[PDB]
């Protein structure tokens, strides 16, 4: 169930009756969209504010509930660059502190800076955990758990099984990024999708991948 829009620069297609995938082509990159008694959710909104103003819109027309709630997966101009127009609308950014600092750093408005390692939120009916496994792909990324349904998003930490090789690694840590893929082998054992943060939803098989792509 692929919906796009206007131009086909934003596209979403369902996970489930709650979840889906937005991706925007900026390179195609993903993030999810929950639908929840409460509002939409994004995990990650766009690479700037043109698109990510542009994926809200179509979020909110299409589900009729307002997104209420952004997650940040790390600091990078691509992740970071819709945080005016969030901030702007009164969503709420949430992001690691160590996100935050980042963003500010690099002359962004700041996100919440309220996550932490293991952060446990809900958002109506739909609980959402952030995890920060470590360094990776960049050293603030984090992964976001969705326990109803084992789905994992993981970001730029995880590669596709188009991506034959790491992409950018100007702020990567590759050494620690095995072992934090490592670490969501570990504390997510039993999943059923991934989404990278470009290409296609895959399982565990991801995470392998991008390990394999680590050596
Ligand atoms: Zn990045």
Known sequence: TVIKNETGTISISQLNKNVWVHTELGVPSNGLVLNTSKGLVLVDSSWDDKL????IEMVEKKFQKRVTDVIITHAHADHIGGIKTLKERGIKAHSTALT???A???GYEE???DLQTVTNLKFGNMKVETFYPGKGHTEDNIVVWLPQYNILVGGSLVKSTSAKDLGNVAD?????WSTSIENVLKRYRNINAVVPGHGEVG???????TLDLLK
Do not use: R, S
């Open 100 to 102: 935050a600092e980042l």
């Open 203 to 209: 399982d565990k098989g991801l995470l392998l991948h």
């Open 111 to 113: 996100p919440l800076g």
């Open 104 to 106: 500010k750093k690099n």
């Open 52 to 55: 990510t103003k542009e994926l």
């Open 172 to 176: 990567a840590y590759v050494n620690e």
